[PDB]
Amino acid sequence: EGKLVIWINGDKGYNGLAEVGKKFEKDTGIKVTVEHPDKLEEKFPQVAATGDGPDIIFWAHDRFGGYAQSGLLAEITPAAAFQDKLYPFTWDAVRYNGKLIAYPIAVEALSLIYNKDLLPNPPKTWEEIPALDKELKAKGKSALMFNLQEPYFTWPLIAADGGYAFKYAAGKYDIKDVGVDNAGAKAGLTFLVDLIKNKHMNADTDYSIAEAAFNKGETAMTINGPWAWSNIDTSAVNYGVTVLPTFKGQPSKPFVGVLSAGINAASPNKELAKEFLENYLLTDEGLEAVNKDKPLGAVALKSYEEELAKDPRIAATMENAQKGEIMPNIPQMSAFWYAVRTAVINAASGRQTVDAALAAAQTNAAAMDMKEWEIFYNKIMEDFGFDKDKDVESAVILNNILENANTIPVDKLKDIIEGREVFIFGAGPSIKKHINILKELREINYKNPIIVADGACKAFLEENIIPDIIVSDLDGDLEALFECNRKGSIIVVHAHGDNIEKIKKYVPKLKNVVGSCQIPNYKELNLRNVINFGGFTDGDRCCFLAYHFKAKKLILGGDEIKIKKLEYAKTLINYLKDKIEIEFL
Ligand SMILES: OC[C@H]1O[C@H](O[C@H]2[C@H](O)[C@@H](O)[C@@H](O)O[C@@H]2CO)[C@H](O)[C@@H](O)[C@@H]1O
């Protein structure tokens, strides 16, 4: 690793980035290898978490906040002379918790691309597209085709009439205020699902299918970004780039991306990556070498944007950009994108209704997703030596057992845990002291939810306080638990590679059970009786649980492999201290 490895998406001008790398090698003899693996935004966090991966990563800024909170990105500290060369708003896109975590490259915004020969007057509104499609279908052509597998391309329509991802409240994105299932979101998605049902589009259209059909003159319109103009030029189709159509009188609001280059925190060539990006790529000569391969958009480098801003296609990119919103860079963006992706794919295929698709996305958009959990998960698994495959087998087993015996619906805990000051109790030393604080606090009518770890069951019975929820792996004294379970307590049973025995044993004899697993696949495994809210120990898992179900504020009242679990606990508890009030007792 005496050289530079660079990762950028396959739809970008990586050949042009290689040209810059060749010049870097020419002057410093440092070989530069540009790669474009599939799903690089998801592969990088995995390879980087261990110390592997490229030296420089390229992607829209929206993923970089999750990379930084995981500690995967070195902090960039360019001289003020260099920062002044880039627009300040592009720097803001890559600032996370006051630290710049990447170099901004170019502003990406989707635009409407139309065939002038097939359609010299592109439509101004979505509503008039169905009439245009049947009209074009009389000539063997379609009106519109674009990638329906990535929510990036359908979000402009979903957001036109009021849809939003996370409310921007008082200078901060409120991860609790998600707007993917409000009136506007449903309206936008419905119009898109109607387009499929009415045969104006196919739910199967993906990137390649849409690009092929448009560049072959089969469809009159597509929706894509500046990177796609290069292939359209080669296809000889006479195209134009214009403003996206309006929906219900309101403009389409595409999430605007800023292509950014992050430096791997484990890379041993940090200073080399710094000089390459600052002195080779982010120059008029360097950005253009990339731009002539595949257009970047509105570049962040001021000197080079003055020339591109004259291009009418770039003019439309910014007009569409000004009507949308720069994406957040917060770590929860990964969860939002998965939620919307699944909702669209499910509502498009008809396999699920628009109402239920968005309602499911609403829950899991703000819910912690297995993206910042992949980091903690495997870190804990090999640190203790747990068998990753056994966490699978136990999670699956737990699910099948709950399919036919004595379940409680998830939203009944949502009935308890919401807008309330939930009490979380571990088996700590001050349990009796803090339980005394709570009792005299509950004795005065401040009677709000109570979630307790397994080892605290008997510690609560003795004061005749029946916990509302109990998080347990069914390891120790189960008698105290069982008594609580029928006096009202809901039991959240957690799957453990070392607990598969007692799962099959004690579960069927319990009432009011909800499933838990640590495994991060499960959603892809399509397990519907278990859930991974996040967390390692019963204590911290209680916190993820209350958080997962929209709890206002947490209130807590609780051989090295015993000391090392208490560290992951505080590690994971501090993780949520920036997402929910966490007042200790
Ligand atoms: O579809 C969700 C996806 O949207 C964006 O991905 C864009 C990216 O910004 C573009 O530069 C280019 O790579 O096309 C992608 C669409 O497939 C977000 O940047 C990305 O995080 C998100 O998952």
Domain containing residue 151: CATH number: 3.40.190.10
Distance (Å) from CA 38 to ligand 1 centroid:
12
Distance (Å) from CA 122 to ligand 1 centroid:
25
CA distances from 3 to 29, 30, 186, 250 (A): 9, 5, 50, 50
Residues 424 and 527 in one domain: yes
Specify the ligand 1 atom closest to the Cα of 333. Answer: 21
* CB contact set of 97 (below 8 Å; sequence gap of 6+): 68
- Other CB atoms within a 10 A radius of the CB of residue 578 amount to 12
- The type of residue at 123 is P
Helices H / strands E in the chain, number of each: 26, 25
- What does the chain come to in residues? 585
C-alpha Rg value of the chain to the nearest Å: 26
Residue nearest to atom 9 of ligand 1 (CA): 60
Cα–Cα distance measured from residue 213 to residue 208, given in angstroms and rounded to the nearest whole number: 8
- Other CB atoms within a 10 A radius of the CB of residue 271 amount to 10
Cα–Cα distance measured from residue 181 to residue 333, given in angstroms and rounded to the nearest whole number: 16
- Cα first-last separation, the chain: 50
Q: Which two tokens stand for residue 104?
A: 């901004």
Binding-site residues, ligand 1, Cβ < 6 A: 9, 11, 41, 60, 62-63, 108, 150-152, 257, 259, 337
**Could you tell me which residues are beta bridge partners of residue 142?**
219
Distance (Å) from CA 356 to ligand 1 centroid:
25
Specify the ligand 1 atom closest to the Cα of 147. Answer: 17
Residues 438 and 475 in one domain: yes
What is the distance, to the nearest Å, from the Cα of residue 282 to the centroid of all Cα atoms in its chain?
Answer: 28
How do beta strands 56-60 and 255-263 pair? antiparallel
Cα–Cα distance measured from residue 227 to residue 298, given in angstroms and rounded to the nearest whole number: 11
CA distances from 153 to 205, 254, 351 (A): 11, 8, 20
Is residue 573 within 8 A of residue 582, CB to CB? The reply is: yes
Is residue 516 within 8 A of residue 493, CB to CB? The reply is: yes
Is residue 262 within 8 A of residue 102, CB to CB? The reply is: yes
Is residue 372 within 8 A of residue 330, CB to CB? The reply is: no
What is the total count of domains within the chain?
Answer: 3
Residue nearest to atom 2 of ligand 1 (CA): 152
Specify the ligand 1 atom closest to the Cα of 9. Answer: 13
**Could you tell me which residues are beta bridge partners of residue 421?**
553
CA dihedral 477, 480, 485, 487 (to 10 degrees): 180
Residue with token string 């898992």: 541
CA distances from 169 to 155, 172, 569 (A): 21, 6, 30
Distance (Å) from CA 259 to ligand 1 centroid:
10
H helix or E strand, kind and range, residue 470: strand 469-472
Residue nearest to atom 10 of ligand 1 (CA): 60
Cα–Cα distance measured from residue 51 to residue 43, given in angstroms and rounded to the nearest whole number: 13
Is residue 467 within 8 A of residue 484, CB to CB? The reply is: yes
- The whole domain housing 305 covers 4-108+257-326
Residue nearest to atom 6 of ligand 1 (CA): 152
Under DSSP, the state recorded for 199 is: T
Distance (Å) from CA 188 to ligand 1 centroid:
20
Distance (Å) from CA 138 to ligand 1 centroid:
34
Nearest residue to 244 via CA among 166, 146, 163: 146
What is the distance, to the nearest Å, from the Cα of residue 146 to the centroid of all Cα atoms in its chain?
Answer: 22
Residues 344 and 214 in one domain: yes
Residues 409 and 322 in one domain: no
Specify the ligand 1 atom closest to the Cα of 151. Answer: 1
Question: Coil, strand or helix: which one is 329?
Answer: coil
Residue nearest to atom 16 of ligand 1 (CA): 152
Distance (Å) from CA 473 to ligand 1 centroid:
39
Residue nearest to atom 4 of ligand 1 (CA): 152
Residues 101 and 132 in one domain: no
- The type of residue at 292 is K
Specify the ligand 1 atom closest to the Cα of 155. Answer: 1
Nearest residue to 517 via CA among 50, 500, 509: 500
Question: Coil, strand or helix: which one is 553?
Answer: strand
Distance (Å) from CA 337 to ligand 1 centroid:
9
Under DSSP, the state recorded for 237 is: -
- The secondary structure of 269-289, three-state, reads CHHHHHHHHHHHHCCHHHHHH
Specify the ligand 1 atom closest to the Cα of 108. Answer: 11
Distance (Å) from CA 151 to ligand 1 centroid:
8
Residue nearest to atom 7 of ligand 1 (CA): 152
Pure H helices in 349-387: 354-366, 373-384
Residues 218 and 362 in one domain: yes
**Burial code of 518-531, b = ≥16 C-beta within 10 A, e = fewer?**
bbbebbeeebebbb
Distance (Å) from CA 225 to ligand 1 centroid:
10
Residues 413 and 450 in one domain: yes
Distance (Å) from CA 422 to ligand 1 centroid:
37
Residues 577 and 474 in one domain: yes
Residue nearest to atom 23 of ligand 1 (CA): 337
What is the distance, to the nearest Å, from the Cα of residue 535 to the centroid of all Cα atoms in its chain?
Answer: 18
Residues 497 and 529 in one domain: yes
Nearest 5°: the CA angle 286, 318, 312 is 80
Nearest residue to 132 via CA among 252, 211, 220: 220
Nearest residue to 276 via CA among 67, 106, 103: 103
Residue nearest to atom 8 of ligand 1 (CA): 60
What is the distance, to the nearest Å, from the Cα of residue 327 to the centroid of all Cα atoms in its chain?
Answer: 12
Residues 458 and 391 in one domain: yes
Nearest 5°: the CA angle 405, 364, 43 is 110
> 97 — alpha (psi -120 to 50), left (phi > 0) or beta?
left
H helix or E strand, kind and range, residue 250: strand 250-251
Torsion 339-61-94-313 (CA) sign: negative
- Burial, 382: exposed, middle or buried (Cβ in 10 Å; 0-12, 13-18, 19+)? exposed
Distance (Å) from CA 8 to ligand 1 centroid:
12
- Other CB atoms within a 10 A radius of the CB of residue 532 amount to 28
Residues 355 and 492 in one domain: no
Pure H helices in 385-477: 388-402, 411-414, 431-442, 457-461
Residue nearest to atom 3 of ligand 1 (CA): 152
Q: Which two tokens stand for residue 58?
A: 């390229």
Residues 215 and 75 in one domain: no
- Burial, 419: exposed, middle or buried (Cβ in 10 Å; 0-12, 13-18, 19+)? exposed
Residue nearest to atom 18 of ligand 1 (CA): 60
Looking at the chain, after which residues does the C atom sit over 2.5 Å from the next written N, breaking the chain? 558
Pure H helices in 29-87: 40-49, 64-69, 80-83
Residue nearest to atom 15 of ligand 1 (CA): 152
Nearest residue to 425 via CA among 458, 388, 384, 389: 458
From 7, 147, 150, give the residue whose CB has the most ligand 1 atoms within 8 Å, as the site to mutate: 150
Specify the ligand 1 atom closest to the Cα of 150. Answer: 1
Cα–Cα distance measured from residue 464 to residue 142, given in angstroms and rounded to the nearest whole number: 69
Cα–Cα distance measured from residue 155 to residue 149, given in angstroms and rounded to the nearest whole number: 12
From 62, 152, 327, give the residue whose CB has the most ligand 1 atoms within 8 Å, as the site to mutate: 152
Decide which of 269, 296, 326 is a domain's last residue: 326
Distance (Å) from CA 152 to ligand 1 centroid:
6
Distance (Å) from CA 163 to ligand 1 centroid:
18
Distance (Å) from CA 408 to ligand 1 centroid:
38
Residue nearest to atom 13 of ligand 1 (CA): 9
Distance (Å) from CA 431 to ligand 1 centroid:
48
The backbone torsions φ and ψ at residue 492, rounded to the nearest 5 degrees and listed phi first, read -95, 105
Is residue 200 within 8 A of residue 133, CB to CB? The reply is: yes
